[PDB]
């Protein structure tokens, strides 16, 4: 096993997907080096839910799942097991038995237009709460009240995916924080990704 895991492709990027439709990257045979994760670029806390970054260079897993998006600063606390909210019920679900880490960092210089950013969409209203690790992208109108809308999208029928509306001149908190979550699985399976 001489390949090197491309962690320099998730953190190093320019076109992170939106929260309502994220990208799931699966890691295969390689050797991972966690030094650059915490030794260098300490923008925010490593926020490791299981085990610890200090002991992340000896144990190894089968596959690594990377999920990336951009969210609100005030919504950052919503990215944790056992919590619910406007993005933890219809947008992104974190299982209560989650293992791995979440990395958030400020992205003002990256995602900010003079008028603002509106390409990022998030779902607001939906029938029920999401199952863990499930994607529910769908273009449809919400039937609110007693009026069976047939695509009119008028009164009492609101489009769930709401434009986000970032800003480069507003105070902190609402400024975009880019979040990449790394998920692991330790099981009696043939080892595929292991560090030095």
């Amino acid at each position, epitope marked *: 096993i*001489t*390949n090197l895991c*491309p962690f320099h492709e998730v953190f190093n*990027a*320019t076109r992170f997907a939106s929260v309502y439709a994220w990208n799931r990257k699966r890691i295969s045979n390689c050797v991972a080096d966690y030094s650059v994760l915490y030794n260098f670029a300490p923008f925010f806390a490593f926020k490791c839910y299981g085990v610890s970054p200090t002991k992340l260079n000896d144990l190894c897993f089968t596959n690594v799942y990377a999920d990336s998006f951009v969210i609100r600063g005030n919504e950052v606390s919503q990215i944790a097991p056992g919590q619910t909210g406007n993005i933890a019920d219809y947008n992104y679900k974190l299982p209560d038995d989650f293992t791995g880490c979440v990395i958030a960092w400020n992205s003002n210089k990256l995602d900010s237009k003079v008028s603002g950013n509106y390409n990022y969409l998030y779902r607001l209203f939906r029938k029920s709460k999401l199952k863990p690790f499930e994607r529910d992208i769908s273009t449809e109108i919400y039937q609110a009240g007693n009026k069976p809308c047939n695509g009119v999208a008028g009164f009492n029928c609101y489009f769930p995916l709401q434009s986000y509306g970032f800003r480069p001149t507003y105070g902190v908190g609402h400024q975009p924080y880019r979040v990449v979550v790394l998920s692991f699985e330790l099981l009696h399976a043939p080892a595929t990704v292991c560090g030095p």
Partner: antibody
Amino acid sequence: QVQLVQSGAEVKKPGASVKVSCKASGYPFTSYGISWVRQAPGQGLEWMGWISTYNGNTNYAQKFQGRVTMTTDTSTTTGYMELRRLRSDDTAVYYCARDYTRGAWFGESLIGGFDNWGQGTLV
Amino acid sequence: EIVLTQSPGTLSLSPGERATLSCRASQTVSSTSLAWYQQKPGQAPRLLIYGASSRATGIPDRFSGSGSGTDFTLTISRLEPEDFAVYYCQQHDTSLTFGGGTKVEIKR
């Protein structure tokens, strides 16, 4: 510490094919792609080729599409042009660089550029 | 494709003076996709800046970058006369296109 070396200067006549080698050392030749660029005297650079190393995907420019094909030998960690259809006044220096703009595994755009350059070869 | 526009045709400056370089875009270029390159006589180009102002290799106190959206520039201060090199700027959003270039002279 990173080292990039190539072959010596070559002289060719139109109608033949030119094979150019680029040896790389000092870094793992698996997590970075190879970018091959032209530089002709009196003008700037071009973007002939982008090649991955983990797989065989290429990103040949449409200007030279259908004429450029190059390979990678991971045993020696070398890039080979086997350029065909040589033309008279295409004499220019050739540069091989370790690219940090497109990932070698998944292929999305990166942030960066060309960080290590060879000595270039002349035909 | 996407083409870049440079109009510092020739800089007539003595060493140690302010140096401004322009890499104006055609229609739209993303903020987090750019590159700059030095070019010394009889050598190979090297990477200098890979974004807004992020340094790549050394950059002691002179090389800085700025800009936003569709315009971008590079700033040099206290120019010690060793460099006097050619400057290249590269875009990244649509395929890959180098800039025309810019010559820096001695100002005898």
